[PDB]
Amino acid sequence: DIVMTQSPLSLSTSVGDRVSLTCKASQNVGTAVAWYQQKPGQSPKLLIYSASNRYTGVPDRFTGSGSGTDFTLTISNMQSEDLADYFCQQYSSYPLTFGAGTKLELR
Amino acid sequence: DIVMTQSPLSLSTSVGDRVSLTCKASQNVGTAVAWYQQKPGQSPKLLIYSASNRYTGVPDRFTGSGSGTDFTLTISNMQSEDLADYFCQQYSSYPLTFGAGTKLELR
Amino acid sequence: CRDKLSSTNQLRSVGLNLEGNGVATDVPSATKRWGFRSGVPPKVVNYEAGEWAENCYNLEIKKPDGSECLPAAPDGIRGFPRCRYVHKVSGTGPCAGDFAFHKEGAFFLYDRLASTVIYRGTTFAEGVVAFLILPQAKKDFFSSHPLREPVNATEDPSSGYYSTTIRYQATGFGTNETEYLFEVDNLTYVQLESRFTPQFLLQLNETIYTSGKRSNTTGKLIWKVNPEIDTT
Amino acid sequence: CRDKLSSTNQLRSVGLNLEGNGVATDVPSATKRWGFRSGVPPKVVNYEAGEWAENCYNLEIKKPDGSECLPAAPDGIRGFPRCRYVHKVSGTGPCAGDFAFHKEGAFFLYDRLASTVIYRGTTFAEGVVAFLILPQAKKDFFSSHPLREPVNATEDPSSGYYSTTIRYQATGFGTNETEYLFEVDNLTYVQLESRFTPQFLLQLNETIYTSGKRSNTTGKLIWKVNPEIDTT
Amino acid sequence: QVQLVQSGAELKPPGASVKVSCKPSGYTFTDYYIHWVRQAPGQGLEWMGWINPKSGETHYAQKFRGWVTLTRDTSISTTYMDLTRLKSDDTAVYFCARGDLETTIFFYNAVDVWGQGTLVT
Amino acid sequence: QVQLVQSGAELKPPGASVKVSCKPSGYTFTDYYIHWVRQAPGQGLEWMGWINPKSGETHYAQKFRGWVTLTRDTSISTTYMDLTRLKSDDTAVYFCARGDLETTIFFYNAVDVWGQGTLVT
Amino acid sequence: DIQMTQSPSSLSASVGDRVTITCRATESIGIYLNWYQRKPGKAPNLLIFATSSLQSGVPSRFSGSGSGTEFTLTISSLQPEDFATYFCQQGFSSPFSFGQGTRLEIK
Amino acid sequence: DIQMTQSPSSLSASVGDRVTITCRATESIGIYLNWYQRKPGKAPNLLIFATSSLQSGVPSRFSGSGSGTEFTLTISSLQPEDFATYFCQQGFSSPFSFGQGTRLEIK
Amino acid sequence: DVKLLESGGGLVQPGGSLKLSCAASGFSLSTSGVGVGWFRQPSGKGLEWLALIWWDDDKYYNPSLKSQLSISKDFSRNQVFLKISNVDIADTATYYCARRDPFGYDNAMGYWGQGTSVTVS
Amino acid sequence: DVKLLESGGGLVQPGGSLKLSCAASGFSLSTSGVGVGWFRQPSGKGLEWLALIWWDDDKYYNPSLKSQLSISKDFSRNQVFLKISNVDIADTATYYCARRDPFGYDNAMGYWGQGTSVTVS
């Protein structure tokens, strides 16, 4: 029904860089989205409830942003241990989809 | 309850005399009365329905008159064969009573 | 109709109103459904109770020979269920039968009692006998049912069963021989089988009673009911 | 209770509504009165017919083990008497008993049939079996009674029995273990045992449905019913 | 199965009594109304009235002639339609129809289960 | 007057069968539910389930042990609580309570009309 | 003393015929009366319950109903046993008179 | 498997005493259970119909009612036959367990 | 023409009783037509008793006179009666009853019937 | 903490079937809490299947895939199953199911469980 995109996997960072991520969708989702992240060798964990709210145990660097066809994730600062593949999703249609995962190089 | 009087038994007449009779009562009867007559050696017959109306087979000489405490009987003309004791009554109370009978002498 | 439970399973136990068939009467049509019988023995029914209803009757009937056609006067208690109005009706025609039996299965009921025969005096709502009920519903359902219905009675029966008359005059009897003069305050009116229930008659006790009344005390009013008079 | 006529005298023959005891339910309180039994054989009743009523139920219940707790599915005809509204209710808790028996004497009836046990699907008005009636009243009284009541039915049942729902969710079972979510259009609401009958719920299908609605399609609405929300 | 067994026919010679037995079998002796019907040969049935065997009451139509009462010993399976003042100027075949005692009376005039009959001359 | 006459007591010696007669009198043989209850001496009654003699169905509680079925010849006045795998590690006195067959079941657990019983050891 | 008039007078008949019989009360009754039929040389058998319901063991062919003074028996598809004489017993009251009327014959 | 708990435990007693006995269901039932009583050395006799109505031929002294999990037998004016052991049979469902409880004694 | 008829009658010892009576030949006595008048004393003096007889209510014109009188009627025959008692010798008369057809509420009951001869000694 | 668990599993011949499954240890599976997510392919590429599982309605995220799959659940045990059939070799993965507690209508089902190793040959 609806498709989604996300900023590219190949991003690069250094510690303390404020960063943000974005995604796009083919429909105006309103606020019905969520973000999550996963690290290799590990099960994924959810990050952003709705368009902005965050899940329990999420670091204080993280909040969601945007609406409709455009959303972003604000991450204050960077830490090397916080690298993960990051994702986002519309809940407005089925099948549900995720934006391509992204991660930042420590460079 | 109510009492009644009638003109005296001793009246005198000659043929063709117009005559009338009267009665009185101790209460205002309205129109609830009747008159009758009887001849000796004979059962009585009714004469006047209500205060004025007459019973079937009554001669055309006869109609009732008056109301309340005072009533009269008009009899046009006289015939010797029409002598009878004449009477009247209130129907407004019980016991019902009749005025004294009256008759006219052929003199 | 033995089925499985007809034999001894408990059944309970109240009269039901025959008016559920849309039945209403002009008064003689009610007697049309009953008449009298016959030297056959009378039968009675025991009830827990029976239904309150707007329409019921009180009776005494007479014979021209002075007998006078009395319906039996049973020693059963003679109170009866509330009824919004009742019509006492009385006088001859005669009872050739020795009792006033129903022809309709119309049990005549009062005080949780009923019979196949009309009795002298107290009102006879007419009906059929309910049978059923869980044996323990007596502690539940019966609180609103006629056994305890007086507990749950409203005060409106005071405008209800209180509003009744005893004045009908049953002159003659049967469909080929009767008339129903209606008394008011020693006044009478021509029967009107085209009109029903004393509320109509109440107008006569408030209107023709107000004027066109027996101001003349020579006797009970015999109003002449012209169909024009009935209409207006 | 043999009396004189219990043995074979004809009796007739319709179901009567249990609500005459002022009974009403929040849904689980109805099941509180029934539950299930027990490997004891089921019993059935044959009727001429039974009463139309505003409140009746359709059922399917499930077991967590996939059995799923089905009530028997009898081969009797499954039409049922008109009922202004019915509540289909469904899902687990489980049937430890092998059938959904009443505890109240609540015969479950449809199509002039009733039973001591609830069956799968078609609505079960609950009631007791009338017994009585003159054998010939069938040509008279029965014309308005449920056998011919469809002949004398008004057109108002179209606003009547038509107005029903099937959306209740029976989560869990018994007084210590159940909840009744109410679906609307793949929306759900917290159960309200303090409110009764879908007209209330209809407001939710016309108001909270209009706004405060599942604009978010992530899943069925689970409205949080705050007592303030219930109040307003 | 009710079988109201009955007495044989006899010629009259008027002034005769002639009880007529009506002995049931297959039935509790006092549990149904007992009859009491008769007809001249060549004639429709005459109701004779009936009896309530539980109490023995006469009911009551032939009392008009006064010709009949019934013997009702409750310890035996029969009753007798005792007759008096019997005359040869009114021949008949007596019969014993059965009613439905201990019920509300919606009758249902008694069924002529019996049958046979007793001619008298 | 129902009288469910019953078999005499016996010592075990385990693995025994031991049918237990329960022979009614004063009753149509198949018109009431038949029992089927037992207790260890010194113990409260154990329900054993019951049988519908009209059809012979087991109902059904002791099938859990599987120890009992009943012989139900309908041409005779008795039934037998056939027992199997009887053991002396569970002594009991068997009894035959009576139910109310051919009625809607509002029961009314069966009355222990009988009584007597059959001790086993 | 309501007489139980009955008609038709005896009739010729044949098998498969459909016929009716009626009773006329001397006075309207509106209440049950019962019918009987008999083999010649035999006592009558109740044919129909006084309430116009068939006596048990009576064939479906038998029918009939009524009200007031009129009660009408019906029979459809006559069979040889149906040539029995039919009757109108008084039913509901004393004296319980017995009506008489048609029987069927062929020649 | 609803147990039929019963109390009081056996009690001392004397003639003319009024007592009560109660059963406690393991789970609420709201439905009939029946009571029995027995002479020592004898089978129990039904004492009360499961619907809290006395068994036929039971003395008027016997009483009792209940709902839910609670059912209470009552007896007034004890008599020597009342020292029979009393019981709480399960009534309404399988397995039909049998409760046990007080009997009366004097010493 | 209806003939009002009178019967009584004749000599009565004083302080005695007499059921004085009348009848309406050729008449359909009914509640229709209201009622009948009642005997007046033709002896005079003047007018005496009238009765307020209604088919459902005998009424007394002058209730003080009830010490000697009471009134009743028969509808099986067109007849009416007077329960004379304690006779006053002053009351002897031929006594005329009368029955005019009522004029609705105006019940003007004339239509005198046959005389009788009431006397005392 | 509820542990979402996974079972399956292991090698499957292509075109075969597998009832892939999960369980929620320490969890009260109920209609409360809505439902469970369903396996996503960790192999990548990227994201794959989620299931719209409601306690009363298994729904398919992408019904075209039903040619290989169907879904069912057990509430007697906290378990859910996948009816894999007609296996595509491209679908091998360790497959993560997930069960986040719903946020009412916002059924954001994260909370991934244990991996399994689905393989084919």
Side-chain angles (χ1 to χ4, degrees), chain A, chain B, chain C residues 14-232, chain D residues 14-232, chain E, chain F, chain G, chain H, chain I, chain J:
Chain A
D1 291 348
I2 299 170
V3 299
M4 175 175 280
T5 68
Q6 184 163 354
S7 67
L9 178 60
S10 178
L11 303 175
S12 182
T13 191
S14 66
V15 173
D17 291 333
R18 180 270 185 193
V19 299
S20 65
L21 303 175
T22 187
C23 298
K24 302 293 186 302
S26 65
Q27 185 267 335
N28 183 329
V29 174
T31 60
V33 299
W35 293 72
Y36 79 92
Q37 60 78 57
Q38 72 90 39
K39 298 180 185 178
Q42 302 178 10
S43 67
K45 176 178 175 180
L46 296 175
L47 297 177
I48 302 298
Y49 177 61
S50 189
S52 64
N53 293 328
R54 68 179 182 171
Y55 288 113
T56 300
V58 173
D60 295 342
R61 295 173 180 88
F62 295 77
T63 185
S65 181
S67 69
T69 60
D70 185 350
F71 297 89
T72 65
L73 176 64
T74 297
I75 303 172
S76 177
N77 294 327
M78 178 59 70
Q79 305 291 321
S80 64
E81 63 275 25
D82 293 337
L83 293 177
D85 290 314
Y86 291 88
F87 303 85
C88 58
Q89 174 170 76
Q90 77 279 34
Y91 293 118
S92 66
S93 71
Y94 301 95
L96 299 172
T97 66
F98 279 95
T102 182
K103 189 174 182 183
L104 302 89
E105 295 183 349
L106 297 175
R107 294 174 179 161
Chain B
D1 291 348
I2 299 170
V3 300
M4 175 175 280
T5 68
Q6 184 163 353
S7 67
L9 178 60
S10 178
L11 303 175
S12 182
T13 191
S14 66
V15 173
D17 291 333
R18 180 270 185 193
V19 299
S20 65
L21 303 175
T22 187
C23 297
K24 302 293 186 301
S26 65
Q27 185 267 335
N28 183 329
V29 174
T31 60
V33 299
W35 293 72
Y36 79 92
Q37 60 78 57
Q38 72 90 39
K39 298 180 185 178
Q42 302 179 10
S43 67
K45 176 178 175 180
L46 296 175
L47 297 177
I48 302 298
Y49 177 61
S50 189
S52 65
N53 293 329
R54 68 179 182 171
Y55 288 113
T56 300
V58 173
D60 295 342
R61 295 173 180 88
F62 295 77
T63 185
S65 181
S67 69
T69 60
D70 185 351
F71 297 89
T72 65
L73 176 64
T74 297
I75 303 172
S76 176
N77 294 327
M78 178 59 70
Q79 305 291 321
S80 64
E81 63 275 25
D82 292 337
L83 293 177
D85 290 314
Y86 291 88
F87 303 84
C88 58
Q89 174 170 76
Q90 77 279 34
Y91 293 118
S92 66
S93 71
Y94 301 95
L96 299 172
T97 66
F98 279 94
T102 182
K103 189 174 182 183
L104 301 89
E105 295 183 349
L106 297 175
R107 294 174 179 161
Chain C
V14 298
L16 301 175
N17 186 357
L18 295 180
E19 291 180 311
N21 192 40
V23 173
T25 186
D26 62 354
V27 174
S29 62
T31 66
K32 182 178 178 182
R33 292 184 293 104
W34 304 326
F36 48 68
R37 298 293 187 277
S38 61
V40 171
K43 298 291 181 182
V44 300
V45 179
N46 295 317
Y47 300 72
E48 287 171 333
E51 189 170 10
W52 294 8
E54 72 178 78
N55 182 299
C56 319
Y57 307 84
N58 289 307
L59 294 170
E60 181 175 287
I61 304 295
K62 297 180 181 305
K63 289 193 184 177
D65 67 13
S67 293
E68 295 174 317
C69 182
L70 298 177
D75 64 359
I77 190 168
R78 299 300 301 278
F80 70 97
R82 290 183 180 165
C83 184
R84 183 180 172 87
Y85 56 90
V86 303
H87 310 261
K88 186 172 184 180
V89 182
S90 67
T92 198
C95 296
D98 58 339
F99 56 84
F101 190 75
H102 64 70
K103 296 185 291 185
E104 302 303 324
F107 286 95
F108 298 107
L109 64 94
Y110 56 89
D111 278 340
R112 310 175 301 281
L113 299 170
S115 179
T116 63
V117 178
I118 295 169
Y119 299 113
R120 192 176 183 191
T122 292
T123 297
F124 301 105
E126 55 182 325
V128 295
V129 183
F131 298 99
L132 72 164
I133 302 299
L134 187 70
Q136 298 305 310
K138 66 184 180 181
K139 298 298 184 181
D140 292 341
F141 280 77
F142 289 0
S143 65
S144 65
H145 300 17
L147 289 171
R148 294 286 79 183
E149 181 179 48
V151 174
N152 286 298
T154 67
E155 295 296 321
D156 289 344
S158 66
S159 67
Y161 80 91
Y162 180 75
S163 298
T164 188
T165 185
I166 62 169
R167 296 289 178 170
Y168 296 83
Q169 172 66 68
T171 299
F173 195 80
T175 61
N176 293 322
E177 179 179 357
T178 190
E179 299 185 79
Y180 291 83
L181 294 177
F182 182 70
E183 289 192 342
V184 177
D185 196 20
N186 301 322
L187 304 170
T188 70
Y189 307 90
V190 173
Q191 67 271 20
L192 296 171
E193 63 276 18
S194 65
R195 296 291 184 273
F196 309 94
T197 296
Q199 185 179 262
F200 174 88
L201 295 172
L202 185 60
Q203 186 172 333
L204 294 174
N205 187 32
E206 300 296 334
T207 58
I208 198 68
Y209 188 78
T210 298
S211 66
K213 66 182 181 182
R214 178 195 65 210
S215 67
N216 183 328
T217 59
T218 305
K220 295 179 178 178
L221 186 67
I222 301 174
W223 193 242
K224 183 179 180 181
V225 181
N226 296 334
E228 295 77 0
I229 288 170
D230 180 51
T231 300
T232 60
Chain D
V14 298
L16 301 175
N17 186 358
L18 295 180
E19 291 180 311
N21 192 40
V23 173
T25 186
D26 62 354
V27 174
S29 62
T31 66
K32 182 178 178 182
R33 292 184 293 104
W34 304 326
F36 48 68
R37 298 293 187 277
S38 61
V40 171
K43 298 291 181 182
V44 300
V45 179
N46 295 317
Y47 300 72
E48 287 171 333
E51 189 170 10
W52 294 8
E54 73 178 78
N55 182 299
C56 319
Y57 307 84
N58 289 307
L59 294 170
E60 181 175 287
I61 304 295
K62 297 180 181 305
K63 289 193 184 177
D65 67 13
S67 293
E68 295 174 317
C69 182
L70 298 177
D75 64 359
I77 190 168
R78 299 300 301 278
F80 70 97
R82 290 183 180 165
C83 184
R84 183 180 172 87
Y85 56 90
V86 303
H87 310 261
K88 186 172 184 180
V89 182
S90 67
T92 198
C95 296
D98 58 339
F99 56 84
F101 190 75
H102 64 70
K103 296 185 291 185
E104 302 303 323
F107 286 95
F108 298 107
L109 64 94
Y110 56 89
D111 278 341
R112 310 175 301 281
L113 299 170
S115 179
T116 63
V117 178
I118 295 169
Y119 299 113
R120 192 176 183 191
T122 292
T123 297
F124 301 105
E126 55 182 325
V128 295
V129 183
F131 298 99
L132 72 164
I133 302 299
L134 187 70
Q136 298 305 309
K138 66 185 180 181
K139 298 298 184 181
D140 292 341
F141 280 77
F142 289 0
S143 65
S144 65
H145 300 17
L147 289 171
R148 294 286 79 183
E149 181 179 48
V151 174
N152 286 298
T154 67
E155 295 296 321
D156 289 344
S158 66
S159 67
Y161 80 91
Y162 180 75
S163 298
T164 188
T165 185
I166 62 169
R167 296 289 178 170
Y168 296 83
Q169 172 66 68
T171 299
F173 195 80
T175 62
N176 293 322
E177 179 179 357
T178 190
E179 299 185 78
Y180 291 83
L181 294 177
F182 182 70
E183 289 192 342
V184 176
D185 196 20
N186 301 322
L187 304 170
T188 70
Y189 307 90
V190 173
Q191 67 271 20
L192 296 171
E193 63 276 18
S194 65
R195 296 291 184 273
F196 309 94
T197 296
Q199 185 179 262
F200 174 88
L201 295 172
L202 185 60
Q203 186 172 333
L204 294 174
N205 187 32
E206 300 296 334
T207 58
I208 198 68
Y209 188 78
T210 298
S211 66
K213 66 183 181 182
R214 178 195 65 210
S215 67
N216 183 328
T217 59
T218 305
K220 295 179 178 178
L221 186 67
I222 301 174
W223 193 242
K224 183 179 180 181
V225 181
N226 296 334
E228 295 77 0
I229 289 170
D230 180 51
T231 300
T232 60
Chain E
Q1 175 63 62
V2 175
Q3 295 293 331
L4 304 173
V5 173
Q6 182 175 18
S7 295
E10 183 176 353
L11 295 175
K12 300 298 174 188
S17 65
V18 181
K19 292 184 188 293
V20 180
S21 175
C22 289
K23 184 179 182 182
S25 69
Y27 155 80
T28 300
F29 180 63
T30 58
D31 289 340
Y32 294 125
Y33 287 107
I34 303 299
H35 302 80
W36 290 76
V37 298
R38 66 192 289 269
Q39 69 180 64
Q43 185 183 57
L45 189 67
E46 181 186 34
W47 180 248
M48 298 172 62
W50 72 99
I51 185 166
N52 181 341
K54 189 66 66 177
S55 64
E57 293 295 346
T58 296
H59 301 288
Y60 49 88
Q62 290 306 328
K63 75 182 184 181
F64 301 171
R65 289 196 291 270
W67 287 17
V68 59
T69 188
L70 269 64
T71 297
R72 181 183 63 95
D73 182 340
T74 61
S75 67
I76 64 173
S77 296
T78 188
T79 63
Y80 299 85
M81 300 188 286
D82 185 284
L83 301 174
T84 186
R85 296 151 58 206
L86 187 66
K87 294 186 285 170
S88 67
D89 66 5
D90 184 347
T91 66
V93 181
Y94 290 75
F95 301 93
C96 293
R98 179 174 58 81
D100 187 0
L101 187 66
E102 305 299 329
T103 65
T104 299
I105 299 171
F106 298 109
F107 291 9
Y108 311 123
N109 187 79
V111 176
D112 182 341
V113 300
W114 185 280
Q116 180 65 52
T118 302
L119 176 66
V120 301
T121 299
Chain F
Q1 175 63 62
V2 175
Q3 295 293 331
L4 304 173
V5 173
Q6 181 175 18
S7 296
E10 183 176 353
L11 295 175
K12 300 297 174 188
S17 65
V18 181
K19 292 185 188 293
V20 180
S21 175
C22 289
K23 184 179 182 182
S25 68
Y27 155 80
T28 300
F29 181 63
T30 58
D31 289 340
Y32 294 125
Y33 287 107
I34 303 299
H35 302 80
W36 290 76
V37 298
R38 66 192 289 269
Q39 68 180 64
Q43 185 183 57
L45 189 67
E46 181 186 34
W47 180 248
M48 298 172 62
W50 72 99
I51 185 166
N52 181 341
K54 189 66 66 177
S55 64
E57 293 295 346
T58 296
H59 301 288
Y60 49 88
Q62 290 306 328
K63 75 182 184 181
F64 301 171
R65 289 196 291 270
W67 287 17
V68 59
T69 188
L70 269 64
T71 297
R72 181 183 63 95
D73 182 340
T74 61
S75 67
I76 64 173
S77 296
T78 188
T79 63
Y80 299 85
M81 300 188 286
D82 185 284
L83 301 174
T84 186
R85 296 151 58 206
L86 187 66
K87 294 186 285 170
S88 67
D89 66 5
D90 183 347
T91 66
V93 181
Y94 290 75
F95 301 93
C96 293
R98 179 174 58 80
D100 187 0
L101 187 67
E102 305 299 329
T103 65
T104 298
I105 299 172
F106 298 109
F107 291 9
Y108 311 123
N109 187 79
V111 176
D112 182 341
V113 300
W114 185 280
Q116 180 65 52
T118 302
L119 176 66
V120 301
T121 299
Chain G
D1 185 7
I2 298 171
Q3 297 291 305
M4 300 299 291
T5 297
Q6 180 182 337
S7 68
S9 69
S10 175
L11 302 174
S12 67
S14 67
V15 172
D17 289 343
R18 180 170 183 169
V19 300
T20 65
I21 304 172
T22 299
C23 304
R24 180 72 58 191
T26 299
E27 301 180 357
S28 175
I29 63 172
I31 188 166
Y32 47 77
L33 78 169
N34 60 338
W35 299 72
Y36 296 76
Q37 68 176 40
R38 67 186 289 269
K39 181 177 179 179
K42 299 290 183 182
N45 301 295
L46 183 67
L47 179 59
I48 193 166
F49 289 126
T51 55
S52 299
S53 176
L54 295 179
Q55 163 64 49
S56 176
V58 175
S60 67
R61 292 186 297 105
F62 292 93
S63 188
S65 69
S67 68
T69 60
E70 187 171 307
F71 301 92
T72 299
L73 192 69
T74 297
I75 303 172
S76 177
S77 196
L78 293 181
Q79 304 294 312
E81 65 274 21
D82 297 341
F83 290 63
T85 302
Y86 297 96
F87 304 98
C88 295
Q89 174 68 56
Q90 184 166 335
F92 68 95
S93 182
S94 175
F96 298 75
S97 68
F98 184 65
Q100 294 183 284
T102 180
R103 62 174 177 81
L104 306 174
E105 65 182 27
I106 187 165
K107 184 176 180 180
Chain H
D1 185 7
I2 298 171
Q3 297 291 305
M4 300 299 291
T5 297
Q6 180 182 337
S7 68
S9 69
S10 175
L11 302 174
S12 67
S14 67
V15 172
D17 289 343
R18 180 170 183 169
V19 300
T20 65
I21 304 172
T22 299
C23 304
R24 180 71 58 191
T26 299
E27 301 180 357
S28 175
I29 63 172
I31 188 166
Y32 47 77
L33 78 169
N34 60 338
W35 299 72
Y36 296 76
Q37 68 176 40
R38 67 186 289 269
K39 181 177 179 179
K42 299 290 183 182
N45 301 295
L46 183 67
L47 179 60
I48 193 166
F49 290 126
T51 55
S52 299
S53 176
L54 295 179
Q55 163 64 49
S56 176
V58 175
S60 67
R61 292 186 297 105
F62 292 93
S63 188
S65 69
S67 68
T69 60
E70 187 171 307
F71 301 92
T72 299
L73 192 69
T74 297
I75 303 172
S76 177
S77 196
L78 293 181
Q79 304 294 312
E81 65 274 21
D82 297 341
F83 291 63
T85 302
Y86 297 96
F87 305 98
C88 295
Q89 174 68 56
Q90 184 166 335
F92 68 95
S93 182
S94 175
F96 298 75
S97 68
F98 184 65
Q100 294 183 284
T102 180
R103 62 174 177 81
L104 306 174
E105 65 182 26
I106 187 165
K107 184 176 180 180
Chain I
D1 183 28
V2 171
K3 306 297 182 182
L4 185 63
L5 306 175
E6 186 178 9
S7 64
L11 190 68
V12 181
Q13 185 176 10
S17 64
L18 182 68
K19 184 175 283 182
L20 193 63
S21 66
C22 291
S25 176
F27 184 57
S28 178
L29 183 65
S30 74
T31 68
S32 176
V34 171
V36 66
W38 208 217
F39 298 117
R40 279 81 103 177
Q41 189 182 24
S43 177
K45 294 192 297 174
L47 184 74
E48 295 293 351
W49 179 266
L50 285 77
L52 284 64
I53 304 304
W54 285 75
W55 70 86
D56 61 359
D57 187 352
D58 297 351
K59 292 181 185 299
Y60 299 90
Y61 166 90
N62 182 340
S64 68
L65 297 176
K66 289 175 69 178
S67 66
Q68 296 183 65
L69 62 83
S70 178
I71 302 169
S72 67
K73 71 279 193 181
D74 179 342
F75 290 89
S76 70
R77 299 173 297 172
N78 300 321
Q79 300 183 356
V80 55
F81 309 94
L82 177 64
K83 299 175 183 178
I84 298 171
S85 66
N86 298 314
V87 173
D88 185 344
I89 65 173
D91 292 336
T92 57
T94 60
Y95 281 119
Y96 287 84
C97 61
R99 193 276 173 185
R100 182 64 61 185
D101 195 76
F103 305 103
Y105 65 92
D106 185 345
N107 194 33
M109 304 301 288
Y111 191 76
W112 294 257
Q114 295 179 322
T116 192
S117 178
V118 176
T119 63
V120 299
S121 179
Chain J
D1 183 28
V2 171
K3 306 297 182 182
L4 185 63
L5 306 175
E6 186 178 9
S7 64
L11 190 68
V12 180
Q13 185 176 10
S17 64
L18 182 67
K19 184 175 283 182
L20 193 63
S21 66
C22 291
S25 176
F27 184 57
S28 178
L29 183 65
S30 74
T31 68
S32 176
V34 171
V36 66
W38 208 217
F39 298 117
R40 279 81 103 177
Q41 189 182 24
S43 177
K45 294 192 297 174
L47 184 74
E48 295 293 351
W49 179 266
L50 285 77
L52 284 64
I53 304 304
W54 285 75
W55 70 86
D56 61 359
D57 187 352
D58 297 351
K59 292 181 185 299
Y60 299 90
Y61 166 90
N62 182 341
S64 68
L65 297 176
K66 289 175 69 178
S67 66
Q68 296 183 65
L69 62 83
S70 178
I71 302 169
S72 67
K73 71 279 193 181
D74 179 342
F75 290 89
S76 70
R77 299 173 297 172
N78 300 321
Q79 300 183 356
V80 55
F81 309 94
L82 177 63
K83 299 175 183 178
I84 298 171
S85 66
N86 298 314
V87 173
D88 185 344
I89 65 173
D91 292 336
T92 57
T94 60
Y95 281 119
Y96 287 84
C97 60
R99 193 276 173 185
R100 182 64 61 185
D101 195 76
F103 305 103
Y105 65 92
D106 185 345
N107 194 33
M109 304 301 288
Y111 191 76
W112 294 257
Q114 295 179 322
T116 192
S117 178
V118 176
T119 63
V120 299
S121 179

